[PDB]
Amino acid sequence: VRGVTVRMETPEAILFSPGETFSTNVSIHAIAHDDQTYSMDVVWLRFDVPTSCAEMRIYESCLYHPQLPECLSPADAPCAASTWTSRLAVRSYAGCSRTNPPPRCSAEAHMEPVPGLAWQAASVNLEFRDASPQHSGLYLCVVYVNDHIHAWGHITISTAAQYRNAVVEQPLDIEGRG
Amino acid sequence: HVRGVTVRMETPEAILFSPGETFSTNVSIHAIAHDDQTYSMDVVWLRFDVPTSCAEMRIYESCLYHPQLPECLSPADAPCAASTWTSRLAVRSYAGCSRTNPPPRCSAEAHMEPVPGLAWQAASVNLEFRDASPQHSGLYLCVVYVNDHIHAWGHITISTAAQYRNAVVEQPLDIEGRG
């Protein structure tokens, strides 16, 4: 029993109307099992969801290795979230530990310039002020601990008309089912 | 770097049943080995009594990782807390697992407590209840260990409507320092 455990909770969708102001409601808890220090990076990724797509496919395995060939050029081509170039936002923490919990170890933070996009100080939730159809899409919140993904989740933030179900393409389960 | 094993679990938080019904849990568990290291895995089911006088059950999340700590062995929340255990309802063990010899294939042992109407869903981690009765009502936790360390866990309150009590997860403050 060592390392860190990260648990994330959040609804898989947020339907909004044009002109509405809202915030994501992601809950993230970090449990340090030893007295080792650790770094943490909470990263937001955004993906366009084409009208022609019946659903958006998230290549789970690709999240850990977004530089792989099959990830850079997803077979489901237009309807797949398997890699990224720019990160919508990133909140970094350094020197975290059992006695110096995440809030206190806050270090740096970055956010891409997007109309109406913002976040509270020391917060990882995203706020959309005066939202519009331009903001609709698939958003992933990925939590790294010591540069390795420890937890992740997806939220389809969209107007009802633009909404498309997000499906997680994962490897076979422990029962060998796909 | 990217190493070790990642376990993801999904399941509804409650199953309401009427006496005499036959049903099964529907837990989904995926394991992703990021390297070629060999590992062991244990899928453990824990069952907790839910007293009629409890307003709600409280799960001490941090305690699941160290069930032998004093505050976990003697939970402050009367008999309405899930924070430690002795007997394990069921355990499916896997050995010699790896990226190329994934879980189903590395299945090794399976154990289950003798309980009227309870059975291991053949080749599955789910629990099946036949001719379910009030005796089966309670708070169930499914915990997945990898190399003897919890990598994922979930809870399911399985019971009749009359015996049902909401289960709340008591967690430390979040990364924003708000709990």
Side-chain angles (χ1 to χ4, degrees), chain A residues 1 3-178, chain B residues 2 4-177 179:
Chain A
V1 183
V4 183
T5 289
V6 179
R7 190 180 59 165
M8 180 188 292
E9 299 296 314
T10 177
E12 60 168 49
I14 294 173
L15 288 297
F16 70 85
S17 302
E20 171 178 13
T21 288
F22 64 95
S23 166
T24 54
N25 182 43
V26 184
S27 180
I28 301 169
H29 291 274
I31 303 173
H33 304 300
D34 54 40
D35 289 298
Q36 295 292 294
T37 57
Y38 66 90
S39 67
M40 177 171 80
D41 300 288
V42 178
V43 182
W44 282 95
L45 305 173
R46 168 200 258 175
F47 299 94
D48 168 277
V49 180
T51 303
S52 53
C53 293
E55 55 191 57
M56 270 299 270
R57 304 179 185 302
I58 302 171
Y59 287 14
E60 174 165 47
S61 295
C62 282
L63 297 182
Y64 305 82
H65 301 293
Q67 301 285 286
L68 271 48
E70 58 263 46
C71 295
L72 294 173
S73 300
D76 291 294
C79 313
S82 59
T83 191
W84 59 85
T85 53
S86 57
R87 296 168 300 181
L88 184 67
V90 183
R91 188 169 285 289
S92 302
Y93 308 70
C96 308
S97 71
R98 287 181 60 276
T99 61
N100 190 47
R104 310 176 180 180
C105 55
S106 176
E108 303 186 317
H110 305 275
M111 177 179 278
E112 296 191 304
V114 175
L117 187 68
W119 56 9
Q120 297 293 325
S123 175
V124 291
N125 277 301
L126 301 174
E127 285 190 20
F128 298 75
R129 285 72 177 278
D130 200 20
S132 100
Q134 80 197 79
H135 301 103
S136 302
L138 173 62
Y139 294 70
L140 270 56
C141 183
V142 184
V143 183
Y144 294 78
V145 169
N146 298 318
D147 301 299
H148 169 53
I149 300 182
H150 279 227
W152 74 274
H154 61 282
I155 310 177
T156 293
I157 304 177
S158 169
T159 60
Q162 293 164 288
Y163 183 81
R164 296 293 183 278
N165 268 292
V167 181
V168 180
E169 295 289 313
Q170 0 68 171
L172 302 173
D173 62 26
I174 63 172
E175 282 178 21
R177 304 174 302 175
Chain B
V2 182
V5 185
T6 290
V7 181
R8 193 173 76 279
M9 183 188 298
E10 287 278 301
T11 176
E13 293 187 352
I15 297 175
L16 279 291
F17 73 83
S18 294
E21 298 190 316
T22 291
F23 65 85
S24 167
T25 58
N26 182 49
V27 181
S28 183
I29 299 168
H30 293 264
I32 300 182
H34 305 300
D35 54 45
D36 291 302
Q37 295 298 290
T38 304
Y39 66 97
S40 67
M41 183 173 86
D42 300 289
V43 174
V44 178
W45 278 99
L46 303 177
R47 182 185 57 178
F48 293 92
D49 173 74
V50 179
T52 303
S53 50
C54 287
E56 50 181 54
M57 288 297 295
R58 303 198 179 190
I59 298 168
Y60 289 6
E61 179 170 42
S62 64
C63 278
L64 304 180
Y65 304 88
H66 44 67
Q68 294 280 245
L69 284 191
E71 324 86 282
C72 297
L73 287 167
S74 299
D77 283 292
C80 315
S83 63
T84 193
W85 57 90
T86 51
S87 297
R88 292 176 295 184
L89 180 68
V91 180
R92 196 173 275 291
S93 302
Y94 308 71
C97 306
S98 69
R99 168 184 280 290
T100 60
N101 186 44
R105 299 197 71 77
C106 59
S107 175
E109 306 194 337
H111 304 273
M112 180 173 279
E113 278 175 43
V115 176
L118 184 69
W120 262 127
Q121 181 168 122
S124 172
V125 293
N126 285 300
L127 300 176
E128 276 191 38
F129 298 74
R130 286 66 180 286
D131 194 21
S133 79
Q135 85 197 72
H136 297 126
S137 300
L139 173 60
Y140 294 70
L141 266 65
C142 182
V143 185
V144 184
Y145 293 79
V146 168
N147 294 327
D148 306 304
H149 172 57
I150 296 177
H151 280 230
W153 74 274
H155 64 284
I156 309 175
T157 292
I158 304 176
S159 61
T160 62
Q163 299 167 286
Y164 182 86
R165 297 294 185 281
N166 183 22
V168 299
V169 184
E170 291 303 314
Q171 57 220 302
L173 293 72
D174 59 28
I175 65 177
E176 300 186 347

